[PDB]
Design brief:
- The structure is cut from a larger assembly and holds chains A (160 residues), B (162 residues), C (215 residues) and D (160 residues).
- Chain A is an all-alpha fold and 160 residues long.
- Helices cover 48% and strands 0% of the residues of chain A.
- Chain A is globular, with a radius of gyration of 19 Å.
- Chain C is 44% helix and 0% strand.
- In chain C, 16% of the residues are buried.
- The chains are: A mainly alpha (160), B mainly alpha (162), C mainly alpha (215), D mainly alpha (160).
- At the B-D interface, loops of B face helix 1 of D.
- The complex binds chlorophyll A (CLA) (3 copies), Chlorophyll c1 (3 copies) and ligand DD6.
- One Chlorophyll c1 (KC1) binds next to helix 3 of chain B.
- The PDB classes it as photosynthesis.
Chain lengths: 160, 162, 215, 160
Amino acid sequence: FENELGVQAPTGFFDPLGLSSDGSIDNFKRRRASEIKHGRVAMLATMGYMTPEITGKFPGYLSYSQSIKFADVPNGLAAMSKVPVLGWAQVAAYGAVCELSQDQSPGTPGAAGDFGFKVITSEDEETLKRKLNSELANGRLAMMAIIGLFFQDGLTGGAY
Amino acid sequence: FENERGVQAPVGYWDPLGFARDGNVALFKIRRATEIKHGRISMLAAMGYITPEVTGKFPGYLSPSMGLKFADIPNGLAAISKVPGYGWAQILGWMAFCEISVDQSPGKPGAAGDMGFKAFKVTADAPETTEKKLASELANGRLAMMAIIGMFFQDGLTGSAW
Amino acid sequence: AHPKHMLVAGVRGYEMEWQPIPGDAVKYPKPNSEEMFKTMIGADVETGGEAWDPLGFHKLFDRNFDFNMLPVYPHVQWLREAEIKHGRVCMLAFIGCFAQAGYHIGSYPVQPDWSKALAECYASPTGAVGLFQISVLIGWIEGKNYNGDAWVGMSEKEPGDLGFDPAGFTKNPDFDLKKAQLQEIKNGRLAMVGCASIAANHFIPGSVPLLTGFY
Amino acid sequence: FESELGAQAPLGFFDPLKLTGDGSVEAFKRRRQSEIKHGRISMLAAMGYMTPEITGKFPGYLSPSLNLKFADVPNGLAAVSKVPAAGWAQILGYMAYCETSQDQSAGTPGAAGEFGFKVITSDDDEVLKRKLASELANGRLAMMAIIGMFYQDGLTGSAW
Ligand code: CLA
Ligand code: CLA
Ligand code: CLA
Ligand code: KC1
Ligand code: KC1
Ligand code: KC1
Ligand SMILES: CC1=C(C#C/C(C)=C/C=C/C(C)=C/C=C/C=C(C)/C=C/C=C(C)/C=C/[C@@]23O[C@]2(C)C[C@@H](O)CC3(C)C)C(C)(C)C[C@H](O)C1
């Protein structure tokens, strides 16, 4: 399996044991959807780890009923136990309307990261290649940095 | 009936009384199955007497709730009261499962001693080695039957195990 | 015979109908049931190698045509679907019963006892939201795999065939899926027996002589 | 029966009383299956009975609910009554999966220890035979070693 937007500059078909059968195109398509979704979520999560620190936490409350404030929710893994769980349920609802609105069954465009977002799309198939591989490489670096920040918060006891 | 297993070197076809000796092949099959099963259960009982004395009682409890601790229980015609009633029930249940899982009855392979227990691994296409093992099983079963009855009597008269 | 209309249930010439869901076309079920039972996964050595169904619960759907020509009793396909679902739910329930007593995850009230955790999480302001999320997720994964039509023996899917197989199973040339299905079914029955034992111990102490100290 | 594995440079065909009955190639095959299985089991047993001494007991609990630790379970024959009963049940379950997944009946790869481990292997048939004989020799040595270790643990107060 080559040409599938996965081989980059400092690396090739990086599989110490990945793609164990070196086939099973259905498994590989599922893994492609998995990796692209993981990368997008990670990029967002690292983004949201480094936004509150470099740009002060939101000015509002985030909970008028529970008297919580944005400036009172700690940044990092501790926020999961501070954000009101109705808020996490609403985040789950947004994830649902973001996952179940458009189908992502195998074969469908949803199974290839094609959720019709565009906005930062391009025009030429080579420019398409550039944008897609940029997104994928940034997502891999994201995943790495996001689990790194997870462990930094877990061990150091704070955001950094 | 003088060509079957059993009949051996020390005594030939042994029949002081009138059992068999009148044909009745089915009756002989029943008696052979009875002899084999009795010899097996006997051999097991013989070991169950010798082992708790030669080595020692098991390192455990046998009743973690009641704390019987194996070794507290004596050996022979006196564990009948010490071993918990549910323990005896489980032992008899295992024996009943061994009896009913197989189908001892006329003709079927369970009526000749083959109870599906294929340990003591003996190979096919090598008879007269399977037959020697079966004859040894019969002889050891007979010896163990007489021995276990003698051990019963020894414990009963002497008041304790051996 | 009787005209095309006026045909309901016991009238001669009335083809059996099955349309419980408003929005789905009418389905006309054949008896089957016994025919599907004769070629059905299960029936291992533990019961003699034959399909152990005393009381004839798999034949009642065939007897529907004799009773009132109505799908009152489930098809054997529905029975296998229910058995599979019960087995999976009971596996999870047994693991949960023996994991909640030692582990705690969320902001739910601390209740190691399994018989009280559900109610105490109902009462929790930050437990009701979580149980609502669990309920909506279960409802999604249950209505998506609605089966339902297995009640009349036409499910178009083998029992317990939700859209879930992250590993390579059901696709590898090896790993005979018949043995895996038999293992799943038998372990599910085992888990259901275990859950029944847990309930009996909770209500009648000393019933199962291995969970005496358990909740 | 000289050429069927074993029969290493030390001594020859060691059978003071065995295999002298009739040969019975299938009986020898069954005994070779048993020998390979016992050798693998005893190699694992010797390694796991000497490792808790070469290296400290694993860092962890092995039973968080029962508050046990890998470090407070005595090594050796004293561990049979210390490892949790469910832990022994799971170990026996993994053993049963090993013994029941692939067929081990006669005239099958499972009858010669051929299950598909394939990690220590090669392609040169001579090297394959050499490695198989090495496995058999190490297995016999481990059988005797683990029996001796068990008896040292029993007669003495602890391991070694
Ligand atoms: C349950 C007991 C039992 C049974 C059913 C059999 C059955 C058989 N034996 Mg056998 N045998 C036994 C015990 C038994 N044996 C014991 C313990 C010995 C060792 C002394 C032998 C030694 C032996 C030899 C040497 C031979 C047989 C042979 C045979 C077969 C010929 C048919 C026959 O006479 O059996 C009929 C079975 C009986 C009559 C059993 C009745 C038991 C009596 C009535 C009760 C009293 C016995 C004893 C003295 C009581 C002790 C306890 C008491 C103090 C309370 C037959 C299959 C022959 C053979 O192989 O033929 C091919 C043969 O040559 N047996
Ligand atoms: C309600 C759960 C449930 C359901 C729907 C099924 C369904 C089925 N089982 Mg099954 N089974 C279950 C639980 C269940 N099983 C449990 C817990 C065990 C362990 C004992 C078994 C053991 C088992 C075996 C060994 C076999 C089946 C077979 C079958 C199939 C035909 C039998 C039939 O029509 O019964 C469906 C109808 C019911 C099960 C009605 C259940 C309602 C009764 C009245 C409840 C009474 C139990 C009560 C609580 C007492 C508890 C007893 C204790 C042991 C727990 C069918 C697919 C056979 C098969 O595979 O055929 C190919 C077969 O050979 N089952
Ligand atoms: C599980 C045990 C086991 C088994 C099944 C085998 C099986 C085999 N070995 Mg073998 N072997 C073993 C252990 C075993 N070995 C050990 C531990 C050693 C090291 C001393 C050897 C050394 C060895 C050599 C050097 C050779 C074989 C050979 C053979 C093969 C032909 C010989 C034969 O038929 O023996 C059948 C198996 C047996 C007779 C094992 C019986 C074990 C006895 C009955 C019990 C011993 C008890 C022990 C000493 C004390 C334990 C404590 C006690 C107080 C409780 C055969 C496949 C030969 C070969 O490769 O042939 C091609 C050959 O040349 N073996
Ligand atoms: C794998 C299934 C299984 C389990 C799980 C299990 C467990 C327990 N067995 Mg059992 N067992 C078998 C199977 C199982 N036993 C089999 C096949 C046999 C061969 C016949 C057998 C033999 C005995 C005997 C002789 C005794 C015994 C007992 C207990 C006991 C203690 C409870 C208590 O005291 O707390 C517990 C927990 C002792 C007893 O005390 O029974 C009240 C007792 O004397 N068992
Ligand atoms: C990335 C977004 C995200 C976060 C960050 C997040 C976090 C938490 N989720 Mg959540 N979640 C989703 C998204 C997210 N969840 C999605 C898409 C689903 C559907 C698959 C889903 C399902 C459930 C369920 C079923 C439960 C649940 C809960 C909690 C909980 C504990 C709060 C606490 O104990 O205070 C925390 C911190 C459990 C709970 O306890 O709620 C009371 C509960 O039962 N979640
Ligand atoms: C991915 C599947 C999986 C899970 C999820 C899982 C989980 C737990 N294992 Mg387990 N396990 C395997 C698989 C899994 N184990 C496998 C393949 C083996 C090799 C045979 C194995 C071995 C042991 C042993 C030896 C013990 C053990 C235990 C526990 C335990 C503790 C519960 C508690 O005490 O909180 C929990 C939660 C200990 C025990 O006591 O269980 C009651 C213990 O002694 N496990
Ligand atoms: C933002 C935010 C939050 C958040 C968040 C979220 C959702 C964070 C998300 C984190 C996320 C998404 C973490 C997963 C990463 C995926 C990984 C690590 C995959 C690795 C996979 C690897 C390393 C595999 C590599 C392979 O080499 C192997 C092994 C075999 C090779 O052949 C093939 C390849 C190359 C593939 C909180 C926590 C809710 C509160 C906080 O306050 C605010």
